A paper describes a structure:
Recently, mutational screening analysis identified the chloroplast-localized HJ resolvase MOC1 that is essential for chloroplast nucleoid segregation in Chlamydomonas reinhardtii and Arabidopsis thaliana. MOC1 exhibits dimerization and an RNaseH fold, belonging to the retroviral integrase superfamily. Moreover, we characterize a base recognition loop (BR loop) that protrudes into the junction and disrupts the C–G base pairs at the crossover. Residue D183 from the BR loop recognizes the cytosine, determining the cytosine-dependent HJ resolution.
After tedious trials, we finally determined two crystal structures of the NtMOC1-HJ complex at an approximately 2.5 Å resolution in the P21212 space group. One of the structures contains the active NtMOC1 and HJ with a noncognate CATG core sequence, and the other is composed of a cleavage-inactive NtMOC1 mutant (D116A/E175A/D253A/E258A) and an HJ with a cognate CCGG core sequence. The HJs in both structures are four-stranded with a 9-bp arm length in each direction with only variation in the crossover with either the CATG core or the CCGG core. These two NtMOC1-HJ complexes exhibit a nearly identical overall fold. In the HJs of both complexes, the CATG and CCGG at the branch point were well aligned. Four acidic amino acids, namely D116, D118, E175, and E258, coordinate a magnesium ion approach to the cleavable phosphodiester backbone, constituting the catalytic tetrad. Alanine substitutions of D116, D118, E175 and E258 completely abolished HJ cleavage activity, although the HJ binding activity was retained. Once the cognate sequence of CCGG (or CGCG) moves to the branch point, residues Y180 and D183 from the dynamic BR loop of NtMOC1 could penetrate into the junction and disrupt the C–G base pairs. Meanwhile, the disrupted cytosine is recognized by D183, generating a favorable HJ configuration, thus facilitating the hydrolysis of the phosphodiester bond by the catalytic tetrad of NtMOC1.
Numbering used by the authors:
A (entry chain B): 110 to 268
B (entry chain A): 106 to 221, 230 to 272
The structure:
DNA sequence: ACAACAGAGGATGGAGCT
DNA sequence: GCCTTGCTGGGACATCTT
DNA sequence: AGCTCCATCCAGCAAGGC
DNA sequence: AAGATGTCCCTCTGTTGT
């Protein structure tokens, strides 16, 4: 009955929806790696695994993951990073026994009405705060983009 | 000190491979399990995460087994899909191996080749004569890659 | 049909309607 | 220090030679 | 089965703002 | 310690030859 939603970007998050128990959300653990000249922010695979096993989730729990579909105007590095975080989350989740279901980014706009007009400058961050009043304190800043995303992904899979 | 345990080399591309070097035992290689996924208007092969964790768990390797994975470093001339797929297979492999309890060591593609593309299969064919029958078709360059990455890994000292 | 080769580097997904 | 806009879309790695 | 529209990002690296 | 320079893939869609 558990539902897990994951925003796989380098500043994404993970949402956990245990039945009959209050909701949860976690920032995706990260680290700093040198890439050529400069440092880059990437997902910490080790810390992700320990965060997953700490859930003590039932075997075969469905995890809904946002599909990486960047735009043609985006740079090559954006495409590389997009597939990297997507594949890593898929790999971690499948190896950890979870059942993974990819989902597009436009999916949660179906049940939670949102359009290009009235752009989600903070619409996503506070529609998720509406569906989850317990996590209203975690979504005040604009940097909580990923936390709200993972919450909406999990809510989409729950319904 | 010299590494006495198992060493594993992985070519993370879609048609890559994985080489297993048990100490004083017949060396083995495996074509990376893939499956055909619908994307856009067509179909492309992508790494089968579920079959990969089934292959690695069939090894029953000691936890912390060193796995050397070739880094994905595409060219600027390559298309966005090339960059996306490059990071995807690289992230999925790292995610699977870390979640499976392996110790993952990224190795640049230049490092293991400098230790020893058209000739790579014959270099691995003579180095591993048992698997020479598998390195007859040049499409097995991914197999020779995993071998030479794994052979490079055993020469790297550990702690 | 599968392999080897050649050449350029590329959105994707979903809703709707024929 | 750590957000927040704002904006384009981007090699990375190693070996040399200043 | 097509075949129209029409929607969807994030990465990364600068400057400024709290 | 920085710069100059030269190397390193793969993806994807065709076409061609087994």
């Amino acid at each position: 009955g558990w539902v897990i939603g994951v925003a796989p970007d380098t500043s994404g998050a993970l949402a956990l929806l245990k039945p009959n128990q209050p909701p949860q959300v976690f920032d995706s653990p990260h680290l700093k790696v040198l890439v050529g000249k400069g440092v880059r922010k990437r997902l910490d695979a080790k810390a992700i695994v320990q965060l997953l096993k700490s859930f003590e989730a039932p075997i075969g729990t469905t995890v809904y993951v946002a599909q990486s579909t960047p735009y043609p105007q985006d740079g090559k590095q954006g495409w590389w990073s997009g597939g990297f975080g997507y594949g890593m989350w898929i790999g971690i989740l499948v190896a950890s026994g979870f059942s993974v279901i990819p989902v597009p980014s436009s999916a949660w706009k179906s049940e939670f009405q949102l359009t290009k007009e009235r752009s989600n400058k903070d619409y996503s961050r506070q529609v998720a705060s509406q569906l989850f009043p317990s996590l209203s304190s975690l979504l005040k800043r604009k940097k909580a983009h990923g936390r709200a995303a993972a919450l909406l992904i999990a809510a989409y899979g729950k319904g």
